């Protein structure tokens, strides 16, 4: 879906598979979090499903030793003195030692502050221990987490349950038309994108000798030239849009290892999983009830939450017993209007627009010379039209899909392109969709705060700040304290401070709250990027402080208060809202659960080969399932006729469904259902 998603995929730790265990074989002990996972395997990253605890992600600083165990870096402490010498320890080896937590205070030389410090011990037991007895210490506070988990700002503020989702979900984010780096970060956003391999990094230092949208050439110092070709509008495995753009301008001096061109969900070489949105924490006329989400039409009019999605369609021409399938622009009984968008071959032309039902590749096959209908024989003598022995086997556009035809790939057996035995011409037609965000699309933040878009109001209906700026996204206050994930709140605060900027007061000295705050943050510009590394970063004190430092807007007025809230005007009534609303900026991702994919319905369609019931799935245009549980719901009601009808003429009564269709189109009454062909099958299976 996005570079991170792939990156995490390479670092999954599955217990499933041959030689491993089954999903039913696994009890509750295998799945829950073990003490030895510390620094080796994340305790947060794991699937929500029935696969829970059987799949995990490898921790950030972890590595695998030649014997297939998982080592982890620790700092060596000689005698109360931290040494920069680092040794990797396996699980059972760390058990024979005693480790100090990373955040334990250390002398400028390297000595501990207090005699008794926080200490990790075998069996996940913890006790205070004299500094004489400290063997090692953790490399980093974020040492236990995974790559994905470390991208969750204020993680220590979110209960594991939502935090878990918040990690699982980032890998579900869809690449937008162009991407912004989050106003709030953790630092991990950089290294994750580079290592992901879906950006472009320069091998050797040099200077950009030539730049184009197509490729980047770099003149090395030694004289050699390495050109990097850009991936442009390519279909991922999941139909998201892997498109790379050049960062550097021509004649830029660039060093090795630097990001010269970033890809999907990457802004200036950082993971840009989403957009920075102006949030407002309030119930708004019910349209955000039960975790639904309200959007400003700005996000639709400015493509802010808009993505590209590429599909690939295939069709081939085989040798049949009645001849061979041939791909041609001559299709039986079709106007020159439907064929208007094809070429002379029978293929659609590049750049043309396609809707569902339309023809992509005109293929015809010879039909079996069976005796045509005596009623259609007669219909062919009147109009004197002789029938063709070729039946339409064309590749039409699947329901739901639509877009612009962005590329044709033709293979022929004639042009010596080596095909599988039996195939002649093989065509692929690629269609891209510029899907703007719509109702029902699932948005999420990094804190397991998910939800589909409820209503997209006109930009004027949106509650707005005093200076006229309409908020972007209206989240429901109700669904925040329940989920224990006030990380979304803290991010919103630090989000606003980063949008407006700030300045601590240095007159009468440096204030006692911002005493621990690094010098570099005492003064901050509008739209400034920051880092809140997990188990470090902003503390609630500093955050409260920064809310007072907030710089005024262009009109010289401060917008939000020290509480972090602000006054809104209901864009509908005009009257101001009675109570100050928590406003600020929050990073939001567009997950790959969009209605354009998820919606589906069927009247009649294809049917099962044996049970003669409908087929299943959107891909097969199948019907829904009315399960054992669902039938109980019918019986409980006592809706005997409804229940029957669904299990009979709506399902596997061979003769019934046909006659129900007739009865409907002729506008008559629905007939009495017959015998379920499935039941017939059963008696033959018993016999």
């Amino acid at each position: 879906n996005n570079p991170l998603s792939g990156l995490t995929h390479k670092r999954r730790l599955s217990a499933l598979g041959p030689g491993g265990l089954s999903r039913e074989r696994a009890g509750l002990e295998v799945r829950d979090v073990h003490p030895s996972h510390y620094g080796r395997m994340c305790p947060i990253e794991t699937p929500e499903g029935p696969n829970i605890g059987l799949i995990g992600s490898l921790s950030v600083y972890a590595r695998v030793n030649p014997f297939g165990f998982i080592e982890t870096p620790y700092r060596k402490v000689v005698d109360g003195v931290v040494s920069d010498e680092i040794v990797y320890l396996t699980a059972d080896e760390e058990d024979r030692h005693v480790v100090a937590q990373a955040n334990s205070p250390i002398d400028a030389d390297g000595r501990f502050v207090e005699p008794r410090v926080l200490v990790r011990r075998k069996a996940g037991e913890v006790e205070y221990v004299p500094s004489s007895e400290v063997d090692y210490m953790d490399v980093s506070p974020r040492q236990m987490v995974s790559v994905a988990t470390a991208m969750i700002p204020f993680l220590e503020h979110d209960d594991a349950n939502r935090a878990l989702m918040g990690a699982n979900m980032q890998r579900q984010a869809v690449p937008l038309v162009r991407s912004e780096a989050p106003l709030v970060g953790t630092g991990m956003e950089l290294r994750a994108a580079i290592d992901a391999g879906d950006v472009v990094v320069a091998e050797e230092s040099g200077v950009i000798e030539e730049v184009s949208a197509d490729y980047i050439t770099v003149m090395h110092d030694n004289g050699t030239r390495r050109t990097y070709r850009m991936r442009k509008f390519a279909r991922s495995n999941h139909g998201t849009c892997a498109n790379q753009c050049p960062i550097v301008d021509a004649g830029d001096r660039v060093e090795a290892g630097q990001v010269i061109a970033d890809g999907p969900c990457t802004d200036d070489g950082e993971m840009a999983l989403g957009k920075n949105l102006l949030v407002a924490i309030m119930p708004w006329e019910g349209h955000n009830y039960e975790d639904a989400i309200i959007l400003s039409n700005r996000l639709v009019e400015e493509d802010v939450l808009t993505s590209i999605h590429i599909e690939e369609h295939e069709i081939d021409a085989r040798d049949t017993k009645l001849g061979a399938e041939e791909i041609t622009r001559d299709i039986p009984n079709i106007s020159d209007e439907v064929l208007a968008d094809l070429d002379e071959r029978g293929i659609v032309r590049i750049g043309a627009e396609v809707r569902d039902g339309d023809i992509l590749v005109g293929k015809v096959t010879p039909k079996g010379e069976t005796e045509l209908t005596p009623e259609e024989r007669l219909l062919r003598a009147i109009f004197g039209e002789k029938a063709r022995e070729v039946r339409d086997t064309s590749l039409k556009v699947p329901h739901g899909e639509s877009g612009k035809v962005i590329g044709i790939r033709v293979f022929s057996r004639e042009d010596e392109d080596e095909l599988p035995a039996g195939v002649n011409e093989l065509v692929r037609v690629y269609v891209a969709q510029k899907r703007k965000i719509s109702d029902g699309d699932k948005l999420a933040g990094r804190h397991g705060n998910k939800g589909v878009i409820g209503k997209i109001l006109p930009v004027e209906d949106m509650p707005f700040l005093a200076d006229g700026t309409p908020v972007d996204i209206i989240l429901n206050t109700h669904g925040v304290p329940r989920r224990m994930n006030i990380g979304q709140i803290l991010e919103t605060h630090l989000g606003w401070c980063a949008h407006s900027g700030w300045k601590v007061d240095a007159a009468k000295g440096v204030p006692d709250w911002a005493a621990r705050l690094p010098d570099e943050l005492l003064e901050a510009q509008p739209n400034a990027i920051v880092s809140t590394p997990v188990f470090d970063g902003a503390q609630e004190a500093e955050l409260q402080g920064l809310l007072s430092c907030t710089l005024p807007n262009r009109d010289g007025d401060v917008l939000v208060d020290a509480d972090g809230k602000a006054m809104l005007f209901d864009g509908r009534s005009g009257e101001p809202f009675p109570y100050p609303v928590t406003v600020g900026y929050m990073y939001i991702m567009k997950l790959h659960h969009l209605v354009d994919d998820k919606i589906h319905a069927r009247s009649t369609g294809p049917y099962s080969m044996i049970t003669q019931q409908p087929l299943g799935g959107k891909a097969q245009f199948g019907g829904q399932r009315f399960g054992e549980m669902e039938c109980w719901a019918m019986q409980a009601y006592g809706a005997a006729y409804t229940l029957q009808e669904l299990l009979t003429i709506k399902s596997d009564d061979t003769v019934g469904r046909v006659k129900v269709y007739e009865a409907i189109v002729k506008g008559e009454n629905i007939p009495e259902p017959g015998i379920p062909e499935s039941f017939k099958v059963l008696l033959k299976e018993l016999q």
Binding site: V60, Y61, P73, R75, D84, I86, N103, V139, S140, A181, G185, G187, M188, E189, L190, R191, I194, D195, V254, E255, G257, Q258, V259, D268, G269, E270, L517, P518, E520, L521, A524, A528, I529, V530, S531, T532, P533, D536, G537, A538, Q539, E542
Partner: peptide, 23 residues
């Protein structure tokens, strides 16, 4: 600054100094 190693944008970090080893 956080990762002053590649040539990357400056993202200012609230922190206790983390110099053991890069990711």
């Amino acid at each position: 600054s956080n990762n002053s190693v590649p040539g990357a944008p400056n993202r200012v970090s609230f922190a206790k100094l983390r110099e053991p080893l890069e990711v």
